[PDB]
DNA sequence: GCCAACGTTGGC
DNA sequence: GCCAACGTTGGC
């Protein structure tokens, strides 16, 4: 079995150090080759999850910190972890003065859009299922989306990934 | 290396 | 705009 991931981005506008960190799935889809590099991860637990990712592994594009937060679509990894250049750019939002270039602290991956979900899967729906499965022993009982609330890159089990995909087929 | 004092994520 | 959950920093 392969690994599956969840990766958060903010679709609504918000300024960090004067610059817009907005990146929706529509913004990915508009990209050249619908491909971008996933810069600006500055959490050690999360960076390590990037380092664990492999060519072709799928990931949910989660929308966070907006009016309707939830999973919007699928993308896959097209380039494994490598140095994030933005940590050395002096005025960049995600600049890190303690990062030296002989061994760079922070990593990023390249991701490519695959598809939208048949429908948006809001956080609130996910949360009902997660609370319910704590009682019923179902597939979202240990989902990282709710067990580790401040983590932008998350592993998912086969169980969890398939369950999210089955919700896609149901009525809202 | 502990742990008060911050600093940040991100739902609500 | 509020603030809980979770992370980092630095005096001791």
Tokens of A102: 């002989």
Q: Which domain holds residue A160?
A: 1-172
Q: What token pair was written down for A113?
A: 């859009």
* β pairing state of A4-9 and A58-63: parallel
**The two structure tokens encoding residue A73:** 């679509």
Our count of domains for chain A comes to: 1
How far apart CA A154 and CA A8 sit, in angstroms, is 9
Q: What share of chain A is helix, strand, coil (3-state, %, to 5)?
A: 30, 30, 40
CA-to-CA distance for A99 and A166, rounded, in angstroms? 42
Q: What's this structure's resolution in Å?
A: 2.6
CA gap A87, A40 in Å, rounded: 8
Asked if residues A57 and A1 have their Cβ atoms less than 8 Å apart, the reply is no
CA of A153 to C1' of B4 (A): 29
In chain A, which residues from 122 to 161 place their CB closer than 7 Å to nucleic acid strand C? Answer: 147-151
- CB-facing half-sphere around the CA of A25: CA atoms within 13 A: 22
Please report the DSSP string for A21-75 in residue order.
----HHHHHHSGGGEEE------HHHHHHHHH--TT-EEEEEE-SSSS-EEEEEE
How many Å does it take to go from CA A150 to C1' C7? 9
Query: What approach was used to elucidate this structure?
Result: X-ray
**Residue whose structure tokens are 């998350």:** A154
Q: What CATH number did the domain enclosing A73 receive?
A: 3.10.590.10
């Amino acid at each position: 079995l392969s690994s599956h991931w969840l990766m958060k981005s903010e679709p609504e506008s918000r300024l960090e150090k004067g610059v817009d960190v907005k990146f929706s799935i529509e913004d990915l889809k508009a990209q050249p080759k619908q491909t971008t590099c996933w810069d600006g991860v500055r959490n050690y637990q999360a960076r390590n999850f990037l380092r664990a990712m492999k060519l072709g592994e799928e990931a949910f594009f989660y929308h966070s910190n907006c009016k309707e937060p939830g999973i919007a679509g699928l993308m896959k990894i097209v380039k494994e972890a490598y140095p994030d250049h933005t940590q050395f750019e002096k005025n960049n939002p995600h600049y890190d003065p303690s990062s030296k270039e002989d061994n760079p602290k922070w990593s990023m991956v390249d991701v490519q859009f695959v598809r939208m979900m048949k429908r948006f899967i809001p956080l609130a729906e996910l949360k009902s299922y997660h609370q319910a499965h704590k009682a019923t022993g179902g597939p979202l009982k240990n989902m990282v989306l709710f067990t580790r609330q401040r983590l932008s890159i998350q592993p998912l089990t086969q169980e969890e990934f398939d369950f999210v995909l089955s919700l896609e087929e149901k009525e809202p």
